[PDB]
Write an enzyme that holds these catalytic residues in place. Sequence first.
Site, mmCIF file in Angstrom:
data_model
loop_
_atom_site.group_PDB
_atom_site.id
_atom_site.type_symbol
_atom_site.label_atom_id
_atom_site.label_comp_id
_atom_site.label_asym_id
_atom_site.label_seq_id
_atom_site.Cartn_x
_atom_site.Cartn_y
_atom_site.Cartn_z
ATOM 1 N N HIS A 86 12.378 11.581 35.902
ATOM 2 C CA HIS A 86 12.131 12.344 34.386
ATOM 3 C C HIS A 86 13.155 13.384 34.282
ATOM 4 O O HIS A 86 13.080 13.893 32.941
ATOM 5 C CB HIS A 86 10.772 12.879 34.331
ATOM 6 C CG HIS A 86 9.789 11.569 34.582
ATOM 7 N ND1 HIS A 86 9.912 10.470 33.773
ATOM 8 C CD2 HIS A 86 8.523 11.386 35.426
ATOM 9 C CE1 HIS A 86 8.793 9.584 34.226
ATOM 10 N NE2 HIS A 86 8.093 10.424 34.851
ATOM 11 N N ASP A 140 4.512 18.652 31.713
ATOM 12 C CA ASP A 140 3.814 18.223 32.953
ATOM 13 C C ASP A 140 4.799 18.348 34.094
ATOM 14 O O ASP A 140 5.171 17.485 34.954
ATOM 15 C CB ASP A 140 3.559 16.580 32.712
ATOM 16 C CG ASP A 140 2.357 16.309 31.909
ATOM 17 O OD1 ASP A 140 1.644 17.283 31.529
ATOM 18 O OD2 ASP A 140 2.025 15.013 31.591
ATOM 19 N N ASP A 178 9.054 2.362 39.507
ATOM 20 C CA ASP A 178 8.071 3.640 39.354
ATOM 21 C C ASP A 178 7.266 2.943 37.876
ATOM 22 O O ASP A 178 7.592 2.214 37.049
ATOM 23 C CB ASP A 178 8.603 4.680 39.220
ATOM 24 C CG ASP A 178 7.535 5.854 38.916
ATOM 25 O OD1 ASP A 178 7.268 6.683 39.982
ATOM 26 O OD2 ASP A 178 6.774 6.025 37.920
ATOM 27 N N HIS A 197 6.331 4.830 35.666
ATOM 28 C CA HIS A 197 6.540 5.582 34.346
ATOM 29 C C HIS A 197 7.908 5.347 34.145
ATOM 30 O O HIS A 197 8.864 4.976 34.935
ATOM 31 C CB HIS A 197 6.304 7.095 34.645
ATOM 32 C CG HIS A 197 4.736 7.494 34.983
ATOM 33 N ND1 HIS A 197 4.497 7.474 36.327
ATOM 34 C CD2 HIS A 197 4.072 7.794 34.264
ATOM 35 C CE1 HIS A 197 3.244 7.806 36.220
ATOM 36 N NE2 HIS A 197 2.952 8.022 34.998
HETATM 37 N N1 LIG Z 1 -2.969 9.534 33.243
HETATM 38 C C1 LIG Z 1 -2.769 10.391 31.791
HETATM 39 C C2 LIG Z 1 -1.076 10.630 31.845
HETATM 40 C C3 LIG Z 1 -0.589 11.791 32.406
HETATM 41 N N2 LIG Z 1 0.817 11.527 32.799
HETATM 42 C C4 LIG Z 1 1.241 12.993 33.900
HETATM 43 C C5 LIG Z 1 2.945 12.868 33.908
HETATM 44 C C6 LIG Z 1 3.347 12.832 35.155
HETATM 45 C C7 LIG Z 1 4.548 11.741 35.974
HETATM 46 C C8 LIG Z 1 4.599 11.357 37.420
HETATM 47 C C9 LIG Z 1 5.396 10.267 37.980
HETATM 48 O O1 LIG Z 1 4.772 9.358 38.303
HETATM 49 N N3 LIG Z 1 6.956 9.944 37.403
HETATM 50 O O2 LIG Z 1 7.116 8.663 37.849
HETATM 51 K K LIG Z 2 10.081 2.944 36.047
HETATM 52 ZN ZN LIG Z 3 5.634 7.506 38.200
#
Ligand SMILES: NCCCNCCCCCC(=O)NO
Ligand SMILES: [K+]
Ligand SMILES: [Zn+2]
Length: 617
Positions: free
Chosen positions: A137, A94, A174, A176
Amino acid sequence: AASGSALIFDEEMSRYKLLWTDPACEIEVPERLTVSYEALRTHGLAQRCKAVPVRQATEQEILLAHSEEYLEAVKQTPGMNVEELMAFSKKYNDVYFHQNIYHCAKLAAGATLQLVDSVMKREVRNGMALVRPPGHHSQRSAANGFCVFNNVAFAALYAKKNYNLNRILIVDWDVHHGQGIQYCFEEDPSVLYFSWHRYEHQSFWPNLPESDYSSVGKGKGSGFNINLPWNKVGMTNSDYLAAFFHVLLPVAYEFDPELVIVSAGFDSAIGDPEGEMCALPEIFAHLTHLLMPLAAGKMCVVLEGGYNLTSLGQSVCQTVHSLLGDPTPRISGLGTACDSALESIQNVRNVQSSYWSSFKSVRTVVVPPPGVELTLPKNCQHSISESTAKEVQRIRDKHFHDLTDQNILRSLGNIISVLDRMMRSDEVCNGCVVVSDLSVSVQCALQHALTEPAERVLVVYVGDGELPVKTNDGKVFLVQICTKETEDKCVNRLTLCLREGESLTAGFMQALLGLILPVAYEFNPALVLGIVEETARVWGHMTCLIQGLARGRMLTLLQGYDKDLLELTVSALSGASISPLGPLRAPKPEDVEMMEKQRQRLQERWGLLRCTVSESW
Ligand SMILES: NCCCNCCCCCC(=O)NO
Ligand SMILES: [K+]
Ligand SMILES: [Zn+2]
Ligand SMILES: [K+]
């Protein structure tokens, strides 16, 4: 002391983009930067911040967190065509590459280091960097999740080496999980990493078992990695605040960091396609404000995610609003966290139980005593109308017939004058008044505020007597810190009797973050009334954190003249930095038991106090 806020941004970082079909990354667009900066300019916030230029991160700075093999592989991407860039990006998860992404990656990293230097050099009090690509990430030898280099990991390592800091707090709000930051500081007890993230029992990206709450760090870094997984979407403001009051803030103030770095991804806000949460942009004004009393305000906000272009700009300005010290917006509709969030919060607190103590034009108006003159900060001012004089006359003859002390009458006129300027004039925010007679001053302040009208008034009283305060109609909540243990009768008063000794600062801070703030936030008062008696440190942190309520409209009544106390309330009320609490002797078990009994007594009415899942009958 330091002043101002830095805004680090450059249009060059918006000059790389996706060049092929990829639904996984097509949401990471250059417009994320241009929309956010233009939102800051539209609201006049960018013009209020010290613009610091972005620079390139040097090779040796990149090697602080990345390997030579991975750096040299990325270094070759500016010379690749579309086909070679597509093949290089397929080797990772990704993430896409561009002819210019290596350039902006060094710029995004250099911008973060520029923000760290300006904050650590005391050139600014705090700041924010609008950067692309994101970083949290990114790993030592891999690009991941739109990130090439780990900007926030750079900042902590850069701050450790060039400023010899022993404790750095990283807050990743965040949506994620920043597993790159977790891997980098897994065994490092000098960097404390907190992260909440959409997890859904490992079914959500990046689908890592290490993203769960049981990953507490490894080796000597055990207990310095705190993962809070969101196992359901639609998390609200109540979930985010419960995460702060019952997980992050108790650990953060015990950690006592020398610098705070925020992985500020706004995909945790409502409307974002990745997060699918329901927190309003206003919550980020409080998430920022609640962290500012840490590290003397030295806070470095680095942009990570955020993909709803309308939801993005609103939360960025709410973050900068708090960095500049603007009044925080009122949050209504707060209550208990959902069952999924309470289960998550319950699990993290249990697994961290073995590592942390808590588990298992004018902003301010001052009225000193007559004759006392003191140096005031720039945004503060000294204290009389003829209508106020007539109202003090009207109040006297009806409620205080046998009362002639013409200096007591002076303070009552100031109380009315200060309150009138705070609620109606909108030109004064808060104030402090030195007071002789308590009972008449509290009665005049409280009664005049209710007819201002302030529909709800929070009263925080540091004293022992009983005050003319009626808490039986739902318009007033009483918070009392006393010396004599009092049986609390009703669900609208919170009385804290801390067993005296050298443990009061730790016990008071745990009651502030765990009881006072959750109740005060759900109460949503229209004005805070601080009261301190003569017989009655920690008051600076209380004054600053409590300004998250009632748009910061707080009136503090100090009985007797203590210039040290007066100077501290005014400094905290004016928005100045709060000197950090040092190491605190862990609170006494008799106080923790007392505070937990009050949570049991009040959490059925004030659900924001819940840190457990309620037992269904
Ligand atoms: N809905 C489906 C999940 C797909 N996920 C894509 C990964 C991108 C990460 C971007 C980010 O916001 N990192 O903090
Ligand atoms: K986080
Ligand atoms: Zn994120
Ligand atoms: K860590």
